């Protein structure tokens, strides 16, 4: 499948794409305001994620640090990034279907739209000012709004027993972004697309 990743924010982001144990395509790239990056993802890929990182520094050899979404200090992510990160998630060609969502389960850093560019399904978006409204206990000094599991580390917030309910914190996310996952057992906001669809991920889709 093809993903076009577009930075419509007024600030630079460093995009990242990973399946958790490997980079997708080149794994990461600087995107200045307006720039697009097209990547190819092997069919069959399960558990892929795309996210933005903010405020990064990298030396000449691809090594450094980002304030949000850092994936072990590398420009080219092989692993998933550190919260807070708004997540575009996908699994491709799973018995003829593609499944996509946006998740706030690892917090929020940048607004996002995740849309198919092919026929047969709808996109999803989380474009509210989560960071501005973020409860003080979840506000990340780095910028962003952490999830409550990351901050508090309880069985309820992390859904460790696989039995957990919604919380004041999950509800905060859900109220601003109803089409994104707010906790692990959220009623799914997953979209099913025809297998082998192509997609566009837009950061800051309104701004």
Description:
The chain is mainly beta. The chain has a single domain (1-207), classed as Sandwich (Thaumatin), CATH 2.60.110.10. Helices cover 11% and strands 36% of the residues. It contains 4 helices and 12 strands. A hairpin with a 5-residue loop joins strand 5 and strand 6 (64-68). The protein is globular, with a radius of gyration of 16 Å. The PDB classes it as plant protein. The entry lists the keywords Thaumatin, vacuum, graphene, graphene-wrapped protein crystals, plant protein. The assembly is monomeric.
The gist of it:
With 207 residues, the protein is mainly beta.
What's the level 1 CATH class? Answer: Mainly Beta
User: What is the ordering of alpha helices and beta strands?
Assistant: EEEEEEEEEEHHHHEE
Task: Figure out the total of helices.
Answer: 4
Main beta sheet, described? Answer: 7 strands, antiparallel
CATH topology: Thaumatin
Q: What fraction of the residues are assigned to beta strands by DSSP? A: 35-45%
Number of domains: 1
Measured between the Cα atoms of the first and last residue, the distance is 27 Å
Structural class: mainly beta
- Helix percentage: 10-25%
* Radius of gyration, in angstroms, nearest whole number: 16 Å
Give the name of the CATH architecture: Sandwich
Total number of beta strands = 12
The CATH superfamily appears as: Thaumatin
Shape: globular
């Amino acid at each position: 499948a093809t993903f076009e990743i577009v930075n419509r924010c007024s600030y630079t982001v460093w995009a990242a794409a990973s399946k958790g144990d490997a980079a997708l395509d080149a794994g990461g790239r600087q995107l200045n305001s307006g720039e697009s990056w097209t990547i190819n993802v092997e069919p069959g890929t399960n558990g892929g994620k795309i996210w933005a990182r903010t405020d990064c520094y990298f030396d000449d050899s691809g090594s450094g640090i980002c304030k949000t979404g850092d994936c072990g200090g590398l420009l080219r992510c092989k692993r998933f990034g550190r919260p807070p990160t708004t997540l575009a998630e996908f699994s491709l060609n799973q018995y003829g279907k593609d499944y996509i969502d946006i998740s706030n389960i690892k917090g929020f850093n940048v607004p996002m739209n995740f849309s198919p560019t092919t026929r047969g399904c709808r996109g999803v978006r989380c474009a509210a000012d989560i960071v501005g409204q973020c409860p003080a206990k979840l506000k990340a000094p780095g910028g962003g709004c952490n999830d409550a599991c990351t901050v508090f580390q309880t069985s309820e917030y992390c859904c460790t027993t696989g039995k957990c309910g919604p919380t004041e914190y999950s509800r905060f996310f859900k109220r601003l972004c109803p089409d994104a996952f707010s906790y692990v057992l959220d009623k799914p906001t997953t979209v099913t697309c025809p297998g082998s669809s192509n997609y566009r991920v837009t950061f800051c889709p309104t701004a």
